């Protein structure tokens with residue numbers, strides 16, 4: 001039975017080599033500049049119509065990578081002491097696209113992610129206070145603010161602020177932050193389930209499109 | 213030779229046991245049909261809408277007086293009235309509990325600084341009648357918010373979730389019907405995981421205990 | 434010579450340990466010394482309020498190092514680190530920290546609101562710039578504080594605090610400092626999950642403790 005462990009580790013090594021080669025040779029569906037430009041073109045419109053136009057355009061530019069209307073749902077998000085709402089359009093293990101915002105405004109922690117985030121503002125204001133600094137910057141509709149991996153900032157969204165977000169990195173690690181206040185502050189298990197279901201629907205779509 | 217009108221005593225005993233079993237299992241159900249709420253659903257709102265024109269101090273005092281006059285033995289006395297902090301859903305305010313049962317509660321809530329956060333999903337229906345200030349509500353699934361001013365009442369259905377914002381110096385009365393302990397579970401989340409203010413935990417639990425003691429001593433006398 | 438009961442000598446040793454512990458606690462309270470006076474940090478920081486908060490912080494650090502050498506962290510150990518607690522978020526820079534005392538620069542460029550925290554310690558805060566809204570427990574009114582003023586937070590008191598944009602202050606705290614650090618990391622653990630900030634805060638406290646120990650044993 002000593003060779004059974006050798007066979008198990010051999011199969012495991014070949015499988016891990018497959019996984020490594022696949023993770024290495026994977027391309028990305030979206031480009032940061034693509035999402036940024038699509039969101040900047042629609043910043044002048046009201047956020048409802050801008051969301052609609054951007055979703056239609058994303059669907060026509062990358063078919064099979066945008067959730068259908070039957071699976072689009074606004075879901076609240078409580079994290080880092082702030083509260084907003086998001087609608088997920090695309091979600092994989094390495095990429096995500098969503099619409100985020102708040103009609104009341106909010107303030108809190110940006111989150112320390114293993115990913116690169118890009119928020120292009122459709123309406124409102126985005127105040128960012130970078131770590132180690134004593135001043136804050138402000139971003140207005142049409143501008144794009146980037147969150148590098150391992151960075152943490154303080155964030156402040158003014159009333160009626162809405163943006164398009166494109167994240168790229170270790171996506172399953174970000175759920176730990178985005179659901180922290182849902183577990184320990186709001187105890188909103190229904191919203192937790194809705195978020196997990198949106199993520200799973202995005203994964204399902206990506207898998208079926210990759211398999212055809 | 214047995215008369216067809218007689219009844220065996222053991223069968224009669226067992227049949228009376230079955231009869232009391234059925235009668236008890238039937239009248240236990242009617243307890244959920246004879247449910248009596250101490251306050252009407254819109255009574256608290258129509259009561260507080262009258263004192264909205266005054267400052268919150270005098271308004272609270274006169275409303276407490278009138279509520280004691282209307283429902284004697286159902287409002288906590290001046291000895292047990294206490295302002296305690298409430299940290300929940302990422303917002304912070306203060307409450308003063310006037311009535312508390314396992315299915316109903318009434319309190320004076322508000323904030324002198326303003327706050328924002330998550331309303332919470334309760335197994336209960338909440339009603340907030342504004343005495344002073346502003347109340348901003350952002351319902352789930354929408355991308356817009358509504359504002360409520362003194363005199364108006366905001367109704368929060370069971371299972372609903374909204375984002376909320378209280379401006380500076382907002383004060384309201386509040387009435388709630390449903391599983392009150394489940395809502396107390398939410399009202400103490402940030403007190404445990406954010407503020408660590410165990411004295412506030414003790415204060416809120418003591419207010420609830422005083423309300424329950426008053427509701428039980430009124431039922432017995 | 435005679436014997437003592439199994440419960441007799443037990444209660445006798447209980448009383449002996451009680452006497453020893455009580456008199457030792459009293460002896461420790463008698464020998465308690467504080468590096469900074471109760472109103473020293475506030476008086477010193479009020480002199481720099483109104484200036485640019487950067488210039489004020491630099492001059493205050495220089496002055497504190499001049500007045501108490503060996504009790505202020507060196508430049509290579511000063512670091513701005515975020516703090517998330519009671520629903521509010523800001524940034525701190527620790528200048529002095531032991532088991533009984535601490536001195537820091539606190540503030541936020543965005544403003545925040547939350548729970549002050551209930552401590553076993555007396556905490557004074559002298560505003561360098563910005564605004565400080567306070568709401569005391571049991572009241573329905575709030576008091577505003579402007580630069581130059583000092584807000585005192587007594588042991589066991591709990592208030593609702595609000596900092597306006599670009600609010601910066603100097604803070605001196607005296608009491609059970611570990612119990613205040615416990616509150617200082619609540620949201621960092623259960624809300625932000627920023628383990629790097631947790632490490633930074635604990636490392637700053639450890640550096641303050643190390644400096645205090647070295648100066649106590651070797652005299653700065």
Ligand SMILES: O=C(CCCN1CCC(O)(c2ccc(Cl)cc2)CC1)c1ccc(F)cc1
Nearest residue numbers: 086110111117145146147155174175178199
């Ligand atoms: O919703 C999220 C979490 C992103 C929050 N999202 C990132 C950080 C943010 O706070 C930010 C701060 C500073 C900067 Cl510079 C840029 C972005 C904006 C909001 C999510 C995560 C996983 C998932 F499957 C679905 C949704």
Ligand SMILES: O=C(CCCN1CCC(O)(c2ccc(Cl)cc2)CC1)c1ccc(F)cc1
Nearest residue numbers: 317331332338366367368376395396399420
């Ligand atoms: O703390 C509470 C619950 C009331 C919170 N109180 C109601 C919900 C609230 O979040 C709300 C938001 C929006 C709307 Cl529309 C209505 C109500 C505002 C604060 C409590 C009170 C007494 C008790 F024994 C146990 C718990």
Ligand SMILES: O=C(CCCN1CCC(O)(c2ccc(Cl)cc2)CC1)c1ccc(F)cc1
Nearest residue numbers: 527530549556558584586594613614617638
């Ligand atoms: O404990 C802390 C974090 C200070 C937060 N610090 C708490 C009190 C504060 O929140 C406050 C509230 C109300 C009032 Cl009135 C005044 C001050 C201000 C900020 C610490 C930091 C470094 C260290 F090495 C040891 C301990």
